[PDB]
C-alpha cells in the first residue's frame, strides 16, 4: 500500500509503547539479553477514517496486509525480531491502534569495573526509516511503557524501565531516521560474594601470613608457597563467577592486589632466612615482628584506597 | 474472520487444557525447560452450528483458516510456541473441539536454597486477549490435563501436574486479559550426593585433621595446607554438579563452613608451633589434645545448626 | 480432503517402515541423538484405484497436496521432524507408497550403570491420532526398516535395528492412537579405558602405597597427600569421558573406593607415627608390614564385589 | 511435471559438479565440517528443446518450478543443504544446465591415530532415488568440479578436491540409487606441538629424574610425586588440544608412556630407599647411578619403538 | 521476471553500499564475526522508467517480487544472509534505490601471531553472477558506505570501515563474476594483559628464583619444583584469555621461554647441590651466586629478543 497523505507540511509522529512481559538470558561476556514484549504502535491514517453511523460499529478490526503499517525496526538486534501481530484497531478518526508480542536479542554494553556492585543501564533502540513521499517521527506513550512485575533477571534487581522522551532525529544515507532510546536499569545483586569469592580467598591469605610466627625456611616455603597455588586453585574454582574483560575490575584489582602480597610475603621469608644465615638473627627477626603488623595493617590501607579508587 | 457475537452481556468462556506429552531439558543455570504437549481448547461458536438430519454428519471437521480461533499464548516463553494443529471438531451445538501438539521453552524461577533436597514448581501460565467486540476469559477442563506416565526428567521426581482453575483476570494496556497457571511439581532425586560430594570432602577434611595427632611443624603444615589443596581441587571437580546461584545455597554454606575449618586448624597448628618454640609445650598439647574432640564435636554442633537453620 | 471411507466396521492399518541413513550427534548428557531417515508408509485409499488399461499407466505419481496423507508423528522427539517428501506412488488397486527423507532430534533414555561396559536401547516413537470418521492403527513392513551398513556412533558399536511389529493401542484424550516401538541397539566400545583411566589412577594409588616401605612421617604424609592431590587433578583431567548421572556408575563406584583407600592410607600411616612416636616401634612397624598385603588384597577383593554387584 | 522420456531402454545420465566456494568449522570431536559451494547439474530434457531461428534466444531462462528437476540429495549430511538456485539454462537441443549455491553440515569419519601428523580425507556423498518411469544415473563433470585458492581451514592444508568418477549403483527399498563421493583431501599442520606439548612435558619428566643425582628420600618423594602433579596439571593445559577418542592415538600412546616413567622412577626411589636403610648402600647407589642412563635410554628406545609402531 | 536490455555492447553497473549498523560476536577460534547492516544498491531498469506528470507521483514504491533484482550474494558467509527489504525507490529515468537490513556471519582469516597487539582486517566480500543475456559488474558509493558510531567490538578499537572501488572480475564455471572487498580494521585493546597475565606469572618465575639465595636442597626442590605448579595452574586460570593457535604467537612464545627457565633453575638446584655434596662448595656456591644475576639477565635479553623477532 502507501502512506497517509500529509496535514500540511509536517511529519506523521507515531506513538510507540513497549511492555515487558519477560526478561531474561543475560550474558555478561557476550553484552546481551534476551526480552519477550508487547509493542504498541498508533499514527493517524484519515484514508482509514469512517463514520460510525452509516457502519454501525465503532472499531474496525484489520489484518496487517490490508493496512499500511509504519516499518518500524531495532537498531541493536542481533536478527528479526520474531514478532507476531495481537491485534489491529481503527477507531472512527483514522487512528490505528497496533499491538505486537516480540522476542528479541538485545546488543546493550555493559561495564563491569565496579563489580560486583555495579548497575547496569539496558538499551532498546527504536528505529523508523522516513520515505520519500512522507517524512516520519516517533513519540512515546507513557501509559503504553511499562514492565509486568514477575519479571526476573537472578543475580539483578530490575529498578526501571522508562524510555528518553525526545527521539533522536538525524540523517542516514540521504533520509531522515527518528531513533527512540529504551532504558531498563539494573543494579547488581551478589550477596554471596563475599561467602564464597572474599571469604575463602582471605583464609588463603591469612594461612600464608602464619610464616611471620615462624623460623623453619623449610616451612616457612610450604606455607607461602603451598598457599599461593591454593590461592590459584581458588581463583580456577570462582573464575566462572569473575568477568572476562579487557578492562580492570574492581574484584579484578583486589584479586591482583592478593598476587602481589603473595610476592612480598616470599621477598620476607627470604630475606628472613638470608639473615639469619648470614650470621645477624637481630634483624632477621626485627623484620619477620613487623611484618606481623606492616602485612595486615598494609592489605587494609591498600584495600580502602582502591575502594575508594573504583567508588 | 470475527468472533462469535455474545449470549447477552457475558463473556467468552474458553475450556484449556493441557497434556504433557514429554518433558525434558531442564536448564538449572537458565532456570529454562522444554515440554512438548497437547492443548485443548473448547468455546461455543453459534455461528457455525448446524442441523445434523440436514447435513449429514454430526462432527464437521475443519481447517484453522476457515474457523475462528481465539488469540490464545503462553507468557512466560522464550519464542513462538512452534504448535500444528491436530485436529477441529465442530459439534451440531456449534462447540469447537480444538486440539494442538506444541514444544515450547519455558522460563519458570527455580529455588536452589535447599539444594539438592529442593523441590521446584514450576509454571506455565495462558493468556488470552480480550478484543473490543467481545470480552475473553479462560477456564480448566479437568479431563483434558494430564501427563504421560513415561515423562522423564532425569534426576528428579515429576510429583504432580496440576492447573489453577481460578484465572487472574486483569487490566493491560487499555484490554482484558485471562491468565491460567499450570503447575509442575518436581522434587530432587540426587542419590550420589553424599558418596561423591560430602563423603570425599569429609575424607579430605578427616586427613587434615590427623595433625591433631602429631607435633611436626614441617608435618602439620603439609598435612593442613595439602589437605586444603586437595579440598579446592575437590571442589572443582564437583564444580559442575554445584549450582550457580547469586544466594546462599545449604550445600554452598557447608562447603563454606569447610573453609572456615581450615583456616582454624591452621590457626590452632600455628598456636601449637609457636607455644612448643616459646618453651612452653605444656600448653602446645593441651590444646592439640583438647582440638582432638574440639573439632569433630564442633564440626557435628555447627553441622545440625545449619541443616535445621535450612530445613 | 478427507480420509478414505471403510472396507466395513474396520480400522485403515498403515504399514511404516524406517531405513536410517547416518545415526549422529548422540548426547550422554542430554539423553538425545540425531539421525537422517527414510519413512516409508502404505494405505489403500480406495478412491484413488483406477483402471490400467483406460489411463495407461500404471502407477500415478502424485504430490503431498493432491492427496490424503494420515497424519504421522514421532513421539519422543525435541520438535518438527523437518521432512521433505522423496516420491509418492499409486498402483492401481489404491495402495499408496509414500516416502520421505527426515531429520530428527530423538530423547531415548540412557542407564550408565554398567559404565563403560553398558549397552544402550534406543527408541523412536511412531504415532498417529485416528479422527471421528474412521479409526487409524500402524503396521510395519519389515522389508522397507533397516539401516544402511556406513551408519556410525564412533565410540558405540551399532547392533540391530529392530521393531516392535505388535502397535500399542490406547484411548488419549477422548480418541484413539496407534503407537509403534522402534529400538536401535548399540553396546560401548571405549578401548581406551584401561589405558587412559584404569592404568593411571591405579599407578597414582600404588605410589601412595610405598608409603608402607617407609617410616618418614614427613615422607609419608607427602606421599599420602601429595598423590592424593594427583588422583583428583587426575580425575578433573578424566572428567570430561566419565558421565554426569544423578544415580551411581560401576566406574563411580571404583572412584569413590580409591577416595576411601587414601583415607584409609592415611589412617594407617597416623597410626604408624602415633605409635613409635608413644615409645612402642614394635606394633607400629607390625601394622605397616601388613598393611604391605593388607592394602592390595583387601582392594582386589572390594574390586572383585563391586564387578561381581553390577554385573 | 513428470521425468523426460528415454532415448530407447537407457538411463538419464546427471552430470555433477562442485565449486568449493568456503570450507570451514571443522569439530575435531563430531566429525563434522561445514561447506559453501556451487553445485552443477547437467541433463538432456528433449520436451524442453526449441528452434533457435524461431524463438529468437539461443538459451532460455526458466524458473525452477516451470522445469523439472532430479531430485539430488548429499547422503553423509546433518540436514536439509539450504540451497538457492543461482541461474538454468536451457540449450537449443534440450540441455538444462542448473546451478545452486549450497551450505551443508557434512558427517565424514576422521582418524587421529596418527595425530597430530595425520591427514584426512573428507567425504561428500552424491544421491538420486531413481523413480518408476525412468532410472537415474550420476556423471561427473571434470571442469564444474574445483575449489576457490582463498578454501582456508586453519590447522591444516587443503591438499586436493577430487571426485569418483565412476558412481555407486545399488537397490535400495525396491529402486535404483546412484551415489557419487567427492573427496576432500587435508593433511594436518599444527607447527608448535613440540613447543607447547612434548618440550614443555618433556622438561616436567627430566626435571623427575634428577632424583637419580640424589640420596634424600624426602627430597626424591618431593621431586618425583611433585613433577608427577606438574604433569597431569600440564596435561589438563594442553587437554583442549588433545582428540577425545575412544581408541588409542600416537600422542596418547606418548602420554600413557610418561604416567608409567613416573611409576618406574617411583619405584627407583624407593628401592634406593629401602637398602640405604636396610644397610646396604653398596646396591642402592649401583642403581641409582645406572637409573642416570637406564631411564633416558629405555625412554628414546621405547619412543622409538611406538613412531616406529604408527608411523 | 527477466533483467534490463543493454545500452549497447556493455555492462550493467550496480551501485553497492554497506553501512554498518551492529558488528558484535567474533569469535577469535572459529574466525567468525556477526554483523546487522543495511546493503544499498542501485541499476538502471528503464521498463520501469515513467512520466511524473501522468502518473501524479515522482517515485513509485515496489515490492521485491515485481521489480527485477540483481542476485547479490556474500562470498564468505556462513548461510543465508537473513535480510529483509527496508525500501525500493525507482525515479522517473528507471534508477532503482535498494535497501535491505541484513544479518550475517562473517568468516574472514585472524593472524594472532602479535597477540595482544595483533590488528585485524575483516573482509566482507559481496558478489554478482553474470547472466547470459547481459553482463553485471559491482561498483562503489561511497556516500553509502559507513558505519555507526556506537558500533562496539569489546576488547578492540573499530578503526576504519573501507571498501577496494575496483572490483575484481573474474571467470567461474563458464561464466563472469564481479567481487567487491569491504575491510573492516580494527587493532586489539587489551588493557589488563600486563596486570593479570605478564605481572602474576613473572611474580610465579621470580619466587622461583630466590633458590638462588637458599643452599637447602630440600626448599629449593620445594621453591622451584611447587613455583613451577604454580605458573601451570596459572597458566589454566589464563587458558580462556589465550589463543588457541596451530602457530606460535608472541604470548604463545614468552609462555614457551618460563617452562624453559624452569628446567634452567632445577639444573642449576641439582647442580649446586651435585657438587655440595661432592665436597666442592667451592664452585657449588660460584655458580648460585652468578644465577642470582645470570637468569634475571638472559632473561631481559631473551625477551627482547622475541619482542625483537615479533616487532
Given at each position: ?7 500540511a507540511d509536517?511529519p506523521?509522529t ?7 512481559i ?12 534476551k526480552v519477550?514484549?508487547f ?8 484514508r ?24 518500524i525496526?531495532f537498531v ?5 525480531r520474531?514478532?507476531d501481530?495481537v ?5 472512527p478518526?483514522?487512528?490505528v ?6 522476542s528479541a536479542?538485545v546488543?546493550?554494553?555493559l ?12 538499551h532498546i ?7 520519500d513521499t512522507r ?7 507513557l501509559?503504553?511503557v ?11 534487581d530490575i529498578?526501571?524501565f522508562t ?10 544515507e540521504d533520509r ?7 532504558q531498563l536499569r539494573?543494579?547488581?545483586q551478589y550477596?554471596?560474594?563475599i ?21 623453619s625456611?623449610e616451612?616457612?616455603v ?10 590459584i586453585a581458588?581463583?580456577?574454582l570462582?573464575?566462572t563467577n569473575?568477568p572476562?574483560?579487557?578492562y ?6 583486589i584479586?591482583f592486589?592478593?598476587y602481589?602480597?603473595y ?13 639469619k ?15 606481623r ?19
Amino acid at each position: 500500500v502507501s502512506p497517509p497523505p500529509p496535514i500540511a507540511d509536517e511529519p506523521l509522529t507515531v506513538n510507540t509503547g513497549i511492555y515487558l512481559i519477560e526478561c531474561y538470558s543475560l550474558d555478561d561476556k557476550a553484552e546481551t539479553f534476551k526480552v519477550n514484549a508487547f509493542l504498541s504502535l498508533s499514527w493517524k491514517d484519515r484514508r482509514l477514517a469512517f463514520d460510525p453511523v452509516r457502519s454501525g460499529v465503532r472499531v474496525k478490526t484489520y489484518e496487517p496486509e490490508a493496512i499500511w503499517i509504519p516499518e518500524i525496526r531495532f537498531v541493536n538486534v542481533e536478527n528479526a525480531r520474531d514478532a507476531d501481530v495481537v491485534d489491529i484497531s481503527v477507531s472512527p478518526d483514522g487512528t490505528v491502534q497496533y499491538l505486537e508480542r516480540f522476542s528479541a536479542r538485545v546488543l546493550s554494553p555493559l561495564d563491569f569495573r565496579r563489580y560486583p556492585f555495579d548497575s547496569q543501564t539496558l538499551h532498546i533502540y527504536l528505529i523508523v526509516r522516513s520515505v520519500d513521499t512522507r517524512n516520519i517521527v516517533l513519540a512515546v506513550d507513557l501509559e503504553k511503557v511499562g514492565k509486568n512485575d514477575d519479571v526476573f533477571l537472578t543475580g539483578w534487581d530490575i529498578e526501571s524501565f522508562t524510555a528518553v522522551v525526545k527521539p533522536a532525529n538525524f540523517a542516514l544515507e540521504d533520509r531522515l531516521e527518528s531513533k527512540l532510546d529504551y532504558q531498563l536499569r539494573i543494579s547488581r545483586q551478589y550477596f554471596s560474594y563475599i561467602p564464597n569469592i572474599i571469604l575463602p580467598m582471605l583464609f588463603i591469605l591469612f594461612i600464608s601470613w602464619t610464616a611471620f610466627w615462624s623460623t623453619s625456611y623449610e616451612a616457612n616455603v610450604t606455607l607461602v608457597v603451598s598457599t599461593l597455588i591454593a590461592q590459584i586453585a581458588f581463583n580456577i574454582l570462582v573464575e566462572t563467577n569473575l568477568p572476562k574483560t579487557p578492562y580492570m575490575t574492581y574484584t579484578g584489582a583486589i584479586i591482583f592486589m592478593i598476587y602481589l602480597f603473595y610476592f612480598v610475603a616470599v621477598i620476607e621469608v627470604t630475606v628472613q632466612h638470608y639473615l639469619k644465615v648470614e650470621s645477624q638473627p637481630a634483624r632477621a627477626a626485627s623484620i619477620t615482628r613487623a611484618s606481623r603488623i606492616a602485612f595486615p595493617v598494609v592489605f587494609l590501607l591498600a584495600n580502602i584506597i582502591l575502594a575508594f579508587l573504583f567508588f
